[PDB]
Amino acid sequence: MSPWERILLEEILSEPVRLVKERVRTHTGRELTYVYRPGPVAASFVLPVTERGTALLVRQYRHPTGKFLLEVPAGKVDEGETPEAAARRELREEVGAEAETLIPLPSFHPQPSFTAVVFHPFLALKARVVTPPTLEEGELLESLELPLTEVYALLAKGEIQDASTALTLFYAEPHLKRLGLL
Amino acid sequence: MSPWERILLEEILSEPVRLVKERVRTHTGRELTYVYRPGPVAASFVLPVTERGTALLVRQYRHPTGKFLLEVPAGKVDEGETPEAAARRELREEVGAEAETLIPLPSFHPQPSFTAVVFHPFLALKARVVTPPTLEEGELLESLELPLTEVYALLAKGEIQDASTALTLFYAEPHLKRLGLL
Ligand SMILES: [Mg+2]
Ligand SMILES: [Mg+2]
Ligand SMILES: [Mg+2]
Ligand SMILES: [Mg+2]
């Protein structure tokens, strides 16, 4: 029961990202052209916490912003892969780490006005580095370790610019306090 | 001091949204094509709270997701407009409301991998409806009022799907408790 009816759906780009331009008839009966990244598509985000109450994060170059941002490891969920598997895979690729339990946190749409993507956050416990990172061509990042108290101080001070990382931290907080890690 | 050098920047679309396809030489000396929504561009988000401890929110159709999402009023910052002015304007357009103090909250990038956009959240106090909403062609939404206790219960239960709305609520929470509204 969509409120808008499709007139024509044009593919504007397929790679590196699929983008479409859709002509639709809206709730007013008038026509509108809507450009967006179609679904279904998703990505997983994972806050990796060690047994020492530190977090394994990444400082990554995000070209559209021209900045290196402090983020939790994350990546697109591949075709036929579960969000938890993509989380573990990106954790191993970007930080060279493995973890035990992965607690799922509330999923969210980062920008529903433009993209159908759903982001799936996870809190990973007993994270540990076991191998060197394996980055894709295109990824420019370094991994680092920070005490959770410092990560949450940055959050409270409003210094975590990546929304997904900030939101993952907020959802993770009650669990970290419950587990005695924060 | 960008780590990537521009080879060529092509405009893929200019309206309804500007999108570019940039060929760059990366940190590895190899070429890569990067598609993104360029900056500088921004939007303001505003959590409007009444003197009765309720919030004025919107239930809005977000076509890429095919869902109506519960969100705080928000919109693109126009050319030469401050983020606070865009916040007040979208509050008046979408909810027909005005407010007194607007407390700025930490800004964030909703999806730095794809867009340069910066979102500027605000907590608006003494919000009150004073006029009928004035929606743009393309906007399909209804305004509603909910007790803050219910809004935060939904947040804690993981039912707030729009990331920006969720993050605005998390940043607003300490202020609401400080002011005795939550
Ligand atoms: Mg990644
Ligand atoms: Mg990756
Ligand atoms: Mg809006
Ligand atoms: Mg609007």
Evaluate whether A83 touches A120 at the Cβ level (below 8 Å): yes
Amino acid at B68: F
Does the annotation count B137 as an active-site position? yes
- With the C-alpha atoms ordered A62, B171, B159, A175, is the resulting torsion angle positive or negative? positive
Evaluate whether A79 touches A104 at the Cβ level (below 8 Å): no
Q: What is the number of CB-based contacts under 8 A between chain A and chain B?
A: 169
Which residues 79-118 of chain A have a CB within 8 Å of chain B? 105-117
Pair of tokens at residue A176: 């970290």
Evaluate whether A32 touches B138 at the Cβ level (below 8 Å): yes
CA of B5 to the centre of ligand 2 (A): 21
Evaluate whether A123 touches A174 at the Cβ level (below 8 Å): no
Spatial neighbors of A8 by CB under 8 A, at least 6 apart, are A22, A23
Kindly report the nearest CA distance between residue B34 and chain A, in angstroms: 7
CA of A72 to the centre of ligand 1 (A): 8
CATH number of A1-182: 3.90.79.10
Distance CA A125, CA A55 (A): 10
Q: For residue B133, give Cα distances in angstroms to B18, B58, B92, B120.
A: 28, 11, 7, 22
Evaluate whether B98 touches B83 at the Cβ level (below 8 Å): no
Chain A contact present for B131, CB below 8 A: no
Q: For residue A12, give Cα distances in angstroms to A22, A29, B64.
A: 10, 25, 15
The C-alpha R_g of chain B, in whole angstroms, comes to 19
- With the C-alpha atoms ordered A100, A106, A108, A110, is the resulting torsion angle positive or negative? negative
Residue B40: asked if its preceding bond is cis (omega within 30°), the reply is: yes
For residue B160, list chain A residues with Cβ-Cβ distance below 8 A. 106, 108
Spatial neighbors of B132 by CB under 8 A, at least 6 apart, are B96
Spatial neighbors of B134 by CB under 8 A, at least 6 apart, are B92, B93, B96
Residue A148 gets the label, from left (phi > 0), alpha (psi -120 to 50) or beta, of alpha
Kindly report the nearest CA distance between residue B15 and chain A, in angstroms: 9
CA of A45 to the centre of ligand 4 (A): 29
Distance CA B18, CA B117 (A): 12
Amino acid at B13: L
Distance CA B62, CA A4 (A): 11
Among B56, B45, B57, B54, residue whose Cα is nearest residue B89: B45
Spatial neighbors of B8 by CB under 8 A, at least 6 apart, are B22, B23
Look up tokens 């929504």; give the residue: B37
Amino acid at A59: R
Out of B36, B63, B162, closest to residue A34 by CB: B63
Distance CA B53, CA A8 (A): 45
Distance CA B90, CA A159 (A): 26
Out of B13, B63, B166, closest to residue A108 by CB: B166
Pair of tokens at residue B10: 């092509």
CB-based burial, A99-109: b 16+ in 10 Å, e otherwise: beebeebbbbb
Q: For residue B163, give Cα distances in angstroms to A49, A91, B135.
A: 23, 22, 22
Distance CA B166, CA A122 (A): 16
Evaluate whether A129 touches A145 at the Cβ level (below 8 Å): no
Domain spans in chain B, listed from the N-terminal domain onward? 1-182
Phi, psi of A178 (to 5 degrees): -65, -40
Chain B contact present for A153, CB below 8 A: no
The residues pairing with B37 across neighbouring beta strands, listed in sequence order, are B115
Spatial neighbors of B82 by CB under 8 A, at least 6 apart, are none
Resolution to 1 decimal place, in Å: 1.7
